[PDB]
Amino acid sequence: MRECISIHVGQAGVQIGNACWELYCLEHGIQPDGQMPSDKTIGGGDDSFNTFFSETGAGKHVPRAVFVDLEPTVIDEVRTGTYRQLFHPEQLITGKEDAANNYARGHYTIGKEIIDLVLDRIRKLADQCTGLQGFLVFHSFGGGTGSGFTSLLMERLSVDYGKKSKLEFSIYPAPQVSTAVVEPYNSILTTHTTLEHSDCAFMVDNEAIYDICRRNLDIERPTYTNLNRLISQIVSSITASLRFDGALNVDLTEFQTNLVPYPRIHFPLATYAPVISAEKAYHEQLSVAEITNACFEPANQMVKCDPRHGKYMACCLLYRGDVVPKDVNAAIATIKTKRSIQFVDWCPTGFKVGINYQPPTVVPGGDLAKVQRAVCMLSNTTAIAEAWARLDHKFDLMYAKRAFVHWYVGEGMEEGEFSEAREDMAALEKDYEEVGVDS
Template structure:
């Protein structure tokens, strides 16, 4: 058995998107570990299914399990909803932090002005959570890089974490701007400013976007007009797959450091796409039953991916598939071979390998879940050169706005220098080039000499 103390992780949820995703994740984690809404182990829950509960929960003297989670928003609306919601008795109110003044979709307000007012309080809370850990492995940060708090305050927080906890792993679950859906016209500014500010400080970023998840809800889960609660439920399942091996013993487990080692071939090329299979509506059947080979194929289907990024238009660098349920290794190997001989292209400078994690627990679902249960399921994380095309599209949107200097005065008015726009854009151009260089075959480079 693994030592649970080796996998203690602190989750930090920033902004409205981050806090809402965090609430959905905590609900699902409680179901998986057999914890009720007050933080106590359910009487009818098998003790051998609680797993390494200390990964995401800290137990107090009353045997109550409290999430190792910090919720932060510059506006108090989302925090008040949590404090008055169904999980109000689960969380420690000391780690629910808000302000009375929001960031108004402005990176500069979250980073330079409003965010600076609470950063000291937030870092004190992080230290308090860290002191309650026997052996802290790292941090999971949840935010949207589209809005003001998630982008601005999220960047400020990442820089502080990098300085204070330099050797700890820092992974992010980020809501990325959608190609066609936008809640604010300045999303390209916020996203590129945030990525520039956090690029050296994050070890791995799992990206999702609302457009892709809307597509999953409509085409896979039979929801014509999904709510944000339902979108967040899909994201929570993706997070569950990624973190299952941290929390439950399995025949093939993947720890926090292994994700970094296997998924990130170059420091800046750390943006990861995520997919889930199978995706079936909970209203159609209690359980669906699919095989390992079908799961592999579905994970590479655009309809199962939580990011609007066409993997087939790039070259696969690394991938990791994480199973829940009993799967024979023969099925896994057949699935890998089927993908190797598909139309997916691969970089030629690395061997074609898939990191595989297997946990024999079947997937858990919430009572009102929109995702149907399956005896065998999997989450896949993919690092592909196709991510460069996502950054290219975002850079083009930035360029159109900045060519007219549109809305720039709102950022400068919060104390940000205009030169930061051009500096950030140049850094993102370098990121694009990094992805392009990753896609160039070694044979092509040799032919040039």
């Protein structure tokens, strides 16, 4: 058994962290007070769930988690709500004034004054690990903390834990729920400084989650609570192999070797099915073939793009519920005859498959119906670069006039970091194109 430390940065990262750890507790039978009756080794153990929870002598299962935010009101809701007993005060770190949607303010001005306290609280958890494998980092692209503090934190983790693996869950900006005009700036700035420090990054476009909630959950105007409960199910799908018995993606290193052959192209596309409203009175349960087919519908992806017009480098299917291999292979056979699935010439056309027999847990009273089987596909497709093209275009429009740039220069950032970051993104866009398109 090797431990994983989760780090939640900023409003988006903290509130998504809330939803995930709630879901984890339901899935593992850990109560809000931290007690877990089914765990018969009291005060310790090296079970699979222990990769995410430590144990006290009193039988309390405590998340290996740090929450960081530069203002207190969002982490104060954790301190005060349903799972207040789960967490040790030392794991919840708040500042006084936030990064004002400004990457430079979160990275340079305010980051400098809190990075040491955070790394010390992270060292507290690392010290109670017999064999830490590394980190899972939740944050938004668009906020000032989520972008600016995270990239500083990522640089320092590479220094202080240079052997360890680092995975991201990143919220990509969507105007239907966005809070700032400058989110394209913050996004590009943080992708540039973080790219070398991340081993695998799962991007979630709020636009995709928003539309999945409207279309498939019948939510007229989704809130962050609607979005986060859906996101947490997907994160749970992705991390279940770290938390349960199995042989696929059992350590953070395997995510990189299964999904990322080229280190810079480390942004797998997630697709999840089925998403069914709990208020749907009559629902016909979907088969292995139907939920697997749905993994190739852009309308079910975490980022709207078109994988028919790129190429795959890897593909992993993560099933939860009543699934056996023969029905997976039958569904894959049919799907390959009917769909444009092109791999790069130097990778095998294939699928790594993981099945956990327990169907997805859903939050009581939440929006998602229980289903007998569900799947999350992780595919490294060059089509996800469509999202970088959208962001870089917005960035170009504002930066050509230097609109809002003075907010960043006034925090000590040099104007040239903007064009450095944007050139890096340009290199990234061209890497994706080399890999995924012929002449």
